[PDB]
Design a protein around this ligand. Structure first.
Ligand SMILES: COCCNCc1ccc(Nc2ncc3cc(-c4ccncc4)ccc3n2)cc1
Length: 263
């Protein structure tokens, strides 16, 4: 298959954010789309190789809970195109507008997010930048997992980084478990309506402490009706040492099981 999208086809619109390799806009191409895109046609083989790699990953993802890849432009500017999510990111809902989701919808947002990752990890893909920001909500109902900028087979966003990633020896601290840890921090975002470590106000300290294992999210901050199995599961994903964290299959199952025992 060739998903290259010929020149002239796209009508690019309003700015949205600065994604890993460039700038996102709303655009049009057989309907509303998103277009992540590098503004310069000065594209060094560092930029032009990242792009080639993101596309290579996006083109292996066909799942309800992964953001639908649709195609790529080379000319005029480098561009990647995806489905447009009516509803914005999970970050926006939880922290910007403070949407008070029902506890069942929370558990489902978790369920679904886990499903996407599980699918991703079976396809042998490490997302490497999971976070509410990159989790998008479709008609406020369905979860779509986003920015594949960093992502691979075989960045000033710290709060979702496992300690070994904050630490650094290997060029390869990333694993399915380092993804599990970021997922851990999403469960917390969802169960607390809050980013972790708000008592601390100094970012560099957060970095140092997490990596050492002095800081770790305050689970007492969960909502009352948060099930104690969900409370116990956050703990599994947030376990300081990578080897004690469960992979997504067992996480799904646990969220599934706990969804069943539910008022
Ligand atoms: C305070 O109120 C603000 C109003 N919200 C505006 C709004 C609404 C919806 C979106 N939706 C949307 N929907 C999907 C999006 C996908 C990517 C994205 C990022 C990286 N790679 C591919 C796509 C990036 C941004 C995306 N944004 C954005 C802003």
């Amino acid at each position: 298959d060739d998903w290259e999208i010929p020149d002239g086809q796209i009508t690019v619109g309003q700015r949205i954010g600065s994604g890993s390799f460039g700038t996102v806009y709303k655009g049009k191409w057989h309907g509303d789309v998103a277009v992540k895109m590098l503004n310069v046609t000065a594209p060094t083989p560092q930029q032009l190789q990242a792009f080639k790699n993101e596309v290579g990953v996006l083109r292996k993802t066909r799942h309800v809970n992964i953001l639908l890849f649709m195609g790529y432009s080379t000319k005029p500017q480098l561009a990647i195109v995806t489905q447009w999510c009516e509803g914005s990111s999970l970050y926006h809902h939880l922290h910007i507008i403070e949407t008070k989701f029902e506890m069942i919808k929370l558990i489902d947002i978790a369920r679904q997010t886990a499903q996407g990752m599980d699918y991703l990890h079976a396809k042998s893909i490490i997302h490497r930048d999971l976070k509410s920001n990159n989790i998008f909500l479709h008609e406020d109902l369905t979860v779509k997992i986003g920015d594949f900028g960093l992502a691979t087979v075989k960045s000033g966003s710290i709060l979702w980084m496992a300690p070994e990633v904050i630490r650094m020896q290997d060029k390869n601290p990333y694993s399915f478990q380092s993804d599990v840890y970021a997922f851990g921090i999403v469960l917390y975002e969802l169960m607390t309506g809050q980013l972790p470590y708000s008592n601390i106000n100094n970012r560099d300290q957060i970095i140092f402490m997490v990596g050492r294992g002095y800081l770790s999210p305050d689970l007492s901050k969960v909502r009352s009706n948060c099930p104690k199995a969900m409370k116990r599961l956050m703990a599994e994903c947030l376990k300081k040492k990578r080897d004690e964290r469960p992979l997504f299959p067992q996480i799904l199952a646990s969220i599934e099981l706990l969804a069943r025992s539910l008022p």
